[PDB]
Amino acid sequence: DTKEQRILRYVQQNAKPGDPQSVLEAIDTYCTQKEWAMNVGDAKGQIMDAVIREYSPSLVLELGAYCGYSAVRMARLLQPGARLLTMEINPDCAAITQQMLNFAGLQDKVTILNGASQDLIPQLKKKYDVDTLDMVFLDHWKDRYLPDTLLLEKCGLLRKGTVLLADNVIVPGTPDFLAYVRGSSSFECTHYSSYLEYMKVVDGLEKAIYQGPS
Ligand SMILES: Cc1ccn2c(-c3ccn[nH]3)c(C)nc2c1
Ligand SMILES: [K+]
């Protein structure tokens, strides 16, 4: 059995249906118990929650779903009517994320997209009826953070005030992405530090607010 399956099994046996907070806590507890390096975790979750509150997005794109922790984290804060679109390359992770959201009672707010971001991003405008995104959470493959930011721009999916929030920008690192957004007049950037256990290293998130085209 995969780590994802076991996490889901544990949630289903210990958390309360329709209680997103209970789901998040169960995931965090189980991974802490097993000493499994979490993808996100509650401290980084707090940063995400504050971003959501501050910009009040109605349409959010998540790149990378894994077991669904971040999808549950964001969807639970969205208003009625709001949508989260989450892209996941691995069908097994997509399946676990769907079940996790169902358990949390948040499935009504989320659409899971199966495939790679390079293939799915250009389909957002017509297949998924997206005009512009309010927020993007980048948590997929490090070497696509910059390409996908450029692709989002090219497809007309960003507008002034669209928030990009990128995880793991120090470890393993996305230095080209950081150099681009920090250097570009199209983005206003803020960094947030957070420690990773086991590797015992400071990592971080970058918030980059799009300003409009150059
Ligand atoms: C090249 C490449 C690698 C991974 N991904 C993902 C991903 C990472 C974790 N879950 N899903 C997505 C949505 N698009 C890509 C593209
Ligand atoms: K900048």
Side-chain angles (χ1 to χ4, degrees), residues 151-162:
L151 184 56
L152 288 161
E153 288 183 70
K154 189 88 246 271
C155 290
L157 292 164
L158 311 180
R159 48 80 176 166
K160 179 171 185 174
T162 296

Side-chain angles (χ1 to χ4, degrees), residues 11-131:
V11 173
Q12 288 176 334
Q13 290 177 331
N14 291 285
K16 296 160 58 175
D19 186 335
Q21 186 63 39
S22 88
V23 170
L24 295 173
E25 287 175 4
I27 295 171
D28 282 320
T29 292
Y30 184 67
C31 294
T32 295
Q33 172 184 354
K34 293 290 185 186
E35 291 194 61
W36 291 346
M38 295 207 69
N39 211 276
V40 167
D42 189 79
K44 286 184 172 184
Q46 300 289 339
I47 295 165
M48 297 164 70
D49 292 351
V51 172
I52 295 282
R53 292 190 200 99
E54 175 172 354
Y55 294 94
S56 301
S58 301
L59 178 57
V60 181
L61 173 64
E62 161 169 91
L63 306 176
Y66 306 98
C67 74
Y69 182 93
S70 63
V72 169
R73 191 94 203 184
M74 293 188 283
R76 89 195 202 283
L77 295 178
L78 298 183
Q79 278 279 306
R83 306 155 72 199
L84 168 68
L85 308 175
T86 185
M87 294 180 178
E88 174 50 56
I89 201 166
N90 187 315
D92 291 336
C93 288
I96 297 268
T97 289
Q98 185 65 73
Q99 288 173 88
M100 195 73 73
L101 288 164
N102 293 351
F103 194 87
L106 295 166
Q107 70 276 10
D108 193 65
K109 294 198 208 164
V110 187
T111 305
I112 299 169
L113 306 190
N114 300 292
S117 56
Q118 61 266 27
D119 297 318
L120 298 166
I121 285 168
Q123 292 180 322
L124 290 173
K125 279 274 185 180
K126 305 304 192 316
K127 189 170 185 180
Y128 299 97
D129 284 278
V130 174
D131 298 306

Side-chain angles (χ1 to χ4, degrees), residues 178-189 208-209 211:
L178 291 181
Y180 175 65
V181 294
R182 290 168 179 183
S184 169
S185 70
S186 294
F187 296 92
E188 290 184 21
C189 305
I209 312 303
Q211 299 299 303

